[PDB]
């Protein structure tokens, strides 16, 4: 009875493992020009937070930033546009709204461009039993949230009721939307990642590589993504391949990865570690290119503009640095 | 060389900085305390005696403001959100002290105390231990099967020897005897001096921290 079902699931696992088992990217990428040495220096230093910052998000126009306080920045000239009285940040594509959520198990939406020159809460979405790990604005009216309830949710701003629930063990720690805003990926603490379908409401694919995953980001193309685990290893997965391409690890580092992001054209993979500094790997190569040193504590967050003009990093010390 | 607009766009940033600086100094005059006891040991029964997710409670005592964070029903992995409580002044741990007869959640309390005390983030955070439930424990001394959970224990029927043995057993789990220090109170249901003990403990730890920062220690 139950043993028959166990054998059935086991042979499903065997058949899928046999079906996904070619070529190696690390060996086909041979005879290519290395980037060399990449040594971007700090261009702006941002002060004002008196805490360990935990999240940030670049603006849509690659000039505004958002970082018990929520600060809007100005990366060109260092000015505080507005301060609003947490583990997540989100900046709406239209620039009208921002989102924040943390251990309180609710996510709050703030409206920026209003009359009376004030920012006030527009929605307080609730329904999770856990802690929110990541939030992203799908549209101006739709937002997706991944929390520690082992489930993800697709919401609706105008009516706070949940629209879709994604389930299918451990806390989900990171979340990333595809460039076309039609697919969706999430990595959990059970050493697994999953690709879902927002329109359907059902899981599409799963990837297993080990320890908990706490960083994930889509490739600019939208057909691959990168994950960062706590075993001091970063990995790249392909949607159309259902496999793992390479491990971004070195023998001298035994420190986990806190944040991961790409650059435009998908050549430089910037990983913010917990060893007081970030690293700049060559996404197509197995060798490190550059190091972004200058932080005096654990690097938590990291972001790259849409035009790829600047890279903003924050750490457990209250200073947020904009490099170029 | 600034424009007419930008010169007026810098005064706004200066006012924002002033507001943040003035508001940032009101959060440095409050003491952070973390409730981390067992779920059914009496955490809900101790918050009311002093006065979804994390619940913050505010106390005032001798012109000192206390913030106490109760992580009641998070029901998640403790290793993924325990980073947020680094720098908390003290951790108030509560033990039922009458939960040894489940056979056992007494060993669960022992394991939880071992996990929290030897944490890497809490290597210098003092722990205040409250051995609760004196009423039932003292009333059950007539037929207490305390030797069941303690095979190596031999002692008199008086509550004093058993209480001393169990307290020494909880103190024995500490591995950092140079920085950390476990405080005990033996709280009762009908006490009134519970806040006094925590006030004295936080004063002691703050004085020791000041001495360590100054250079004498």
């Amino acid at each position, epitope marked *: 009875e139950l043993d028959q079902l166990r054998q059935e699931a086991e042979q499903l696992k065997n058949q899928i493992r046999d079906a996904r088992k070619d070529a190696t990217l690390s060996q086909i990428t041979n005879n290519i020009d290395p980037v060399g040495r990449i040594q971007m220096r700090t261009r702006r230093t941002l002060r004002g937070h008196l805490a360990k910052i935990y999240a940030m998000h670049w603006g849509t126009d690659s000039r505004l930033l958002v970082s018990g306080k929520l600060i809007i920045w100005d990366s060109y000239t260092t000015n505080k546009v*507005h301060a609003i009285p947490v583990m997540t940040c989100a900046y709406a594509p239209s620039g009208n709204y921002v989102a924040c959520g943390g251990l309180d198990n609710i996510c709050s939406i703030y409206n920026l461009k209003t009359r*009376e*020159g004030n920012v006030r809460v527009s929605r307080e979405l609730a329904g999770h039993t856990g802690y929110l790990s990541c939030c992203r604005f799908l549209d101006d009216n739709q937002i997706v949230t991944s929390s520690g309830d082992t489930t993800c949710a697709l919401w609706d701003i105008e009516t706070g009721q949940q629209t879709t629930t994604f389930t299918g063990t451990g806390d989900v720690m990171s979340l990333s939307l595809a460039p076309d805003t039609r697919l969706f990926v999430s990595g959990a603490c059970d050493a697994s990642a999953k690709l879902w379908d927002v329109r359907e409401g059902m899981c599409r694919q799963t990837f297993t590589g080990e320890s908990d995953i706490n960083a994930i980001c889509f490739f600019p193309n939208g057909n691959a993504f990168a994950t960062g685990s706590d075993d001091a290893t970063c990995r790249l997965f392909d949607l159309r391949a259902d496999q793992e391409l390479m491990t971004y690890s070195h023998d001298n580092i035994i420190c986990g990865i806190t944040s991961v992001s790409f650059s435009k054209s998908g050549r430089l993979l910037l990983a913010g570690y917990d060893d007081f500094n970030c690293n700049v790997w060559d996404a197509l190569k197995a060798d490190r290119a550059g190091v972004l040193a200058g932080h005096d504590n654990r690097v938590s967050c990291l972001g790259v503009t849409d035009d790829g003009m600047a890279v903003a990093t924050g750490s457990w010390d209250s200073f947020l640095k904009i490099w170029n | 060389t600034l*424009s007419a*607009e930008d010169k007026a766009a810098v*005064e*706004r940033s200066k*006012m924002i900085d002033r507001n943040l600086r003035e508001d940032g100094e009101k959060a440095a005059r409050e003491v952070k305390l973390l409730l981390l006891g067992a779920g059914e040991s009496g955490k809900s029964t101790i918050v009311k005696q002093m006065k979804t997710g994390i619940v913050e409670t505010h106390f005032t005592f001798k012109d000192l403001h206390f913030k106490m964070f109760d992580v009641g029903g998070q029901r998640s992995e403790r290793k993924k959100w325990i980073h947020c409580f680094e720098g908390v002044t003290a951790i108030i741990f509560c033990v039922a002290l009458s939960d040894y007869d489940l056979v056992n959640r007494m060993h669960e309390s022992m394991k939880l105390f071992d996990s929290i005390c030897n944490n890497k983030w809490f290597t210098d955070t003092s722990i205040i231990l409250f051995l609760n439930k004196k009423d039932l424990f003292e009333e059950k001394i007539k037929k207490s099967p305390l030797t069941i959970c303690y095979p190596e224990y031999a002692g008199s029927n008086t509550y004093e020897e058993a209480a001393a043995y169990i307290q020494c057993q909880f103190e024995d789990l500490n591995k950092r005897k140079d920085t950390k220090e476990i405080y005990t109170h033996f709280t009762c249901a009908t006490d009134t001096k519970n806040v006094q003990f925590v006030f004295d403990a936080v004063t002691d730890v703050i004085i020791k921290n000041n001495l360590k920062d100054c250079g004498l220690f």
Partner: single-chain antibody, 229 residues
């Protein structure tokens, strides 16, 4: 949302009086507040500008050291003390507000109050003045700036306030189009040449337009013909 201006000017020469204004539904503590005047046959020119926190009290170049501004954030009240009133004070005063992010200054205008007395400036001239609006057609306004209004910030200053026959003006372009119901309004800029364009006329489209000729501390862009007649 609402700005109520009070204080009626009818005094003998050599007197003084106050002009008050009260704001509702604002973060008045975080809005800069200007004061503007309009003569019966003239444009809209500054008389004072006040910044948030009372750190910038710029006054008028025509009259300096006689008028003063006082502000009350708890009372949400902004008012003007006038001294040594002369014969040439017979204008309509408005109490426009503005705020500068890193966004649409002069967005809201008050009702204004009358003042009558009993008995480095950019200037532009054109042959065509007070062009009547032809029904069933499209009207366009062309203007030229004496200097280059474009600044190294890249933000050329282009204001096109519209004043209908009535009580208070409106904003059309704040630098383009503001948060207004109409859409047909367009503004084209190229160096020193600027053009306001109307896609189609309407019953409420008729009015008087005012130019932009301001870069420095005195924003005297009021040079403009009155198209009322």
């Amino acid at each position: 949302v609402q700005l109520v201006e009070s204080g009626g000017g009818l005094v003998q020469p050599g007197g003084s009086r106050k002009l008050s204004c009260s704001a509702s539904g604002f973060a008045f503590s975080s809005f800069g507040m200007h004061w503007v005047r309009q003569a019966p046959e003239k444009g809209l020119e500054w008389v004072a500008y006040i910044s948030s926190g009372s750190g910038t009290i710029y006054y008028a170049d025509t009259v300096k050291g006689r008028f003063t501004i006082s502000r009350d954030d708890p009372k949400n009240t902004l008012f003007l003390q006038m001294t040594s009133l002369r014969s040439e004070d017979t204008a309509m005063y408005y109490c426009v507000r503005s705020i500068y992010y890193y966004s649409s200054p002069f967005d809201f205008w008050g009702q204004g109050t009358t003042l009558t007395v009993s008995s480095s400036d950019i200037v532009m001239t054109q042959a065509t003045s007070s062009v009547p609006v032809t029904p069933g057609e499209s009207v366009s306004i062309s203007c030229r700036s004496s200097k280059s209004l474009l600044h190294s910030n890249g933000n050329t200053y282009l204001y096109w306030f519209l004043q209908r026959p009535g009580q208070s003006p409106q904003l059309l372009i704040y630098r383009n189009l503001a948060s207004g119901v109409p859409d047909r309004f367009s503004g084209s800029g190229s160096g020193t040449a600027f053009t306001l364009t109307i896609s189609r006329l309407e019953a409420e489209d008729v009015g008087v337009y005012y130019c932009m000729q301001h870069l420095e501390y005195p924003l005297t862009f009021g040079a403009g013909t009155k198209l009322e007649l």
